[PDB]
Design a protein around this ligand. Structure first.
Ligand SMILES: O=C1NCCc2[nH]c(-c3ccnc(-c4cnc5ccccc5c4)c3)cc21
Ligand SMILES: O=C1NCCc2[nH]c(-c3ccnc(-c4cnc5ccccc5c4)c3)cc21
Ligand SMILES: O=C1NCCc2[nH]c(-c3ccnc(-c4cnc5ccccc5c4)c3)cc21
Ligand SMILES: O=C1NCCc2[nH]c(-c3ccnc(-c4cnc5ccccc5c4)c3)cc21
Lengths: 285, 284, 285, 283
């Protein structure tokens, strides 16, 4: 018998409890994230500021539901305050000061296929939880994957529920409608996996002609980066990047794929990612 | 960085915390106001009783937002209780025992143009705050303006949000930033009617009254208005425009020199004080 | 920087510039095609006559757009004239006197699997261009596939846009970039049907119980015709003729298939097509 | 009898006639503006690239109609081409290499009340023309005001019809909403900046949004201490929050401060310096 507590929205002023700096930690889909400090405990946290409405209410609601998952940024508290005579949802979440996923990769000198497998597995676990409780994330990108600390054993966490949406013998179609909201995360996972293995996206710019290469599904595994990467992985990427949403792999089939399943049985083959990523600081702005 | 705390609705029985008398302190647009006493502290407060529904929820919500302003009656606590098997919003507010604005004026024996300017400025300040946070009061009348105490330095405060309504890149016109109808300009009319009474003791509008209002027929008759400066008559004339869009905005009003420099307005005495008691009859 | 010129509709009478014979060169979905001669140059061209309306305007507009592709019949000029007191779009296009695709195949005495691969690749290229500019052809059939000349190095070209229709950050999924129904996947079926006929000489769907065999997906690879054809090709055909539109292969997947990719590494195995086609002149009317 | 010619859209490829560089000359509301050169004549022009649709068709249509006005950027040619298999309106317009209005002010070391009057008058003329042919611009801002050359006698010209809209006793002759009066506000904002170097509505934010709807601004010293009460009064009247209380373009062009530009005091303004001294919060 597992129940978890529901969300108690705090109504007192947030400045009673926290010292709010104006150092920006990230730009969210609807409002920025600031650095804040626990007045009593001195410890550091992140504050996301949203203007109260049905949209913001849903973000908080869905995020809170997912907050249980180890690979989703944890909500610490939610405040409802008045800010310049308008209502506000202020979300306090744990501080992910390990930085973005591709910043950590970008800082070495090498990255291996086995480590890419481990990273993909923990992203996968976040998506798997979300899908199992009928939530599509709809915005799984590089900027939304951050690490808890700089320490080498930090946990990778998924952030930002600004685009998240609820997805609702007896066959699965006969148990509630459900459109393509979910399969759209599976594409993201494909795009991230591709970047993790070579350092660049599968879809380029040069650029209104990028938009067509995406709908056509024109990409490649060019050498030298991909010459080492096993056909088994390319085949997995090929399957997450199908242009037809229903041809795409589901999160359960993904988590059961042998490359993800047995992360520790994946060859230690080194990838170019680490260098290709710093060597290309320009067109990453 | 100013945040103010939001509204925490108490759910325990109000009678745990307050002794509720049944002395009526006023009749609100939707429910009366009773005198109550803090059980622990002995101190006196006012309780407004509302039946829970979307209407009452908005009154509380809007009033709480405005409660910060120094010239708006301060909400102390909001209770949600069961009263005769129905849900209830009970609002506890500070006690305004100085009485109504025109009751204080009515009790002397003289009132001056400069004081009228100081009164008008503090009503203005309440309206100014409301408008700035996108709330129209829609019911600014003599009965809604009360004083905190009888002491001569008491603050004047506005009450009753029963009619209040909400009114909704960097060089953009005000019309292109959200629709907004005439909700606000309607307070500006009240302000003109109050100002008129403040300076002479009777209203500017006396079934043929209904048409004099829509026509805009009123005057500044003597002897009351013969001392009053043309500058003030001109300001009243402009708040009482029958066409809502021709009417002055609350910012233009707070910037008008008569309101701006209250202390440079002539000390000229008005008839208000006497005309008001001399006319106790047709004020019921 | 590639721009190509847009469409200038000529308004002068077409008979100023061309001699119009009444030899019919084909029947289009909305108006027949006549043989005409350039008055000044003596050279031969084809004229398609359409009655001006939103439908005909779209054909011209879409055909002009695709006219740049090497494997699509080239539009020479478009006239807007009065014919019997009604407005008219007259389209002048290059003369494809090499005749229909299956007429050329039918005239030998043998056809090989490698040539079928080369034909399919060039039809594919036309579809690929169209899809990449968001146009579905919707009428890819034997009669719409003609050769430029009789000379053995002639180019195969696609005609008739009477059914053609338009089909409408940087990690964003293909579904989230505009709706789009099954218009395109319907060309992919035609490609399968054409490929099947090219390898054996008859259609996969035969002689009101035909209508049900198509929706059921009942067809075979009967002997003796199909006994030489590699399992690789049968598998590609099986995948284009999927009854469920979304299970069907996309044009990019198709142009990447090794059988199409390396036309010149396909076995030179002879097919029955050439003979089966003339031997069955009857039920082809 | 004055007829002017209508718009002939050229259908041939633009690269036949022009050499198209990719030096960006400005960012428009729907597509950027590039520097191009007349292949035959060597002369320089600006190209705006739009994707064909009803929106872009209207921009070109409305712009063409206003192109006659001396104070509106002149369209040279309009091409309809295929770019990556999609149709395209390409607009060639005269090259305004004198740069933006506030860049030219920002480059001296002084600006006078009389010159501000002359600038406001020529912006007003553009709006006046547009309104008289029933078009509201709806996007009169600092970036849309450019000069033809650097030469000191250059003409100031208005650009960008991406937001322009057609606007159809005076009330009995066709409906018409507040489209027009919204240009009149821009005119006030621009006049304010021209006289002191900063906007009337600040950031430092979500509280700027409310100061605009409330109409809270001032004429603070030292900048405004020389500026005549007559001008402050005109600005006050363009910046009325109520659109119908706002002055019309005809009333504006008739105001004595605009009418007799050359009888306006030569009083120097702070604008020139306040503008460079505040390069930061202007990005
Ligand atoms: O919801 C979101 N969307 C936009 C991106 C984002 N970051 C966060 C976030 C959450 C918790 N911590 C951080 C954070 C903390 N400290 C950092 C230090 C250095 C780099 C990045 C950091 C991010 C960011 C939340 C969101
Ligand atoms: O919202 C309202 N509706 C209608 C009028 C009103 N009066 C009040 C009010 C609020 C607080 N205190 C008082 C009050 C208290 N004590 C008094 C003593 C003597 C005369 C008047 C008094 C009013 C009235 C609230 C409202
Ligand atoms: O759009 C169309 N509608 C359906 C059939 C068609 N044929 C053509 C066409 C176009 C250009 N040339 C020809 C042509 C010319 N000469 C031929 C000689 C012998 C056989 C077929 C021929 C076709 C046909 C166009 C269309
Ligand atoms: O439609 C528009 N909207 C966005 C801004 C813009 N600039 C232009 C424009 C038009 C003509 N010339 C230029 C131009 C020419 N030369 C320049 C030199 C230096 C700086 C800016 C320049 C702009 C810009 C049009 C538009």
């Amino acid at each position: 018998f597992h129940v978890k507590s529901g969300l108690q929205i705090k109504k007192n002023a947030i400045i009673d409890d926290y010292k709010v700096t104006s150092q920006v930690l990230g730009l969210g889909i609807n409002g920025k994230v600031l650095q804040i400090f626990n007045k009593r405990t001195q410890e550091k946290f992140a504050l996301k500021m949203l203007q109260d409405c049905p949209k913001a209410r849903r973000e908080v609601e869905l995020h809170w539901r997912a907050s249980q998952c180890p690979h989703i940024v944890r909500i610490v508290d939610v405040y409802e305050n008045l800010y310049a005579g308008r209502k506000c949802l202020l979300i306090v979440m744990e501080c992910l000061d390990g930085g973005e996923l591709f910043s950590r990769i970008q800082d070495r000198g090498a990255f291996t296929e086995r480590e890419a497998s481990e990273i993909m597995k923990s992203i996968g676990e976040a998506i798997q939880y979300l899908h199992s409780i009928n939530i599509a994330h709809r915005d799984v990108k590089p900027e939304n994957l951050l690490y808890t600390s700089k320490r080498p054993n930090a946990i990778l966490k998924l952030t930002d529920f600004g685009f998240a949406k609820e997805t609702t013998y007896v066959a699965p179609e006969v148990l509630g409608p459900e459109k393509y909201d979910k399969s759209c995360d599976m594409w993201s996972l494909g795009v991230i996996m591709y970047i993790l293995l070579c350092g660049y996206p599968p879809f380029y710019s040069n650029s209104p002609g990028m938009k067509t290469r995406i709908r056509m599904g024109q990409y490649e595994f060019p050498n030298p980066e991909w010459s080492e990467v096993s056909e088994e992985v390319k085949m997995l990427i090929r399957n997450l990047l199908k242009t037809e949403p229903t041809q795409r792999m589901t999160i359960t089939e993904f988590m059961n794929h042998p490359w993800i399943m047995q992360s520790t049985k994946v060859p230690q083959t080194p990838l170019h990612t680490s260098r290709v990523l710093k060597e290309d600081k320009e067109r990453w702005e």
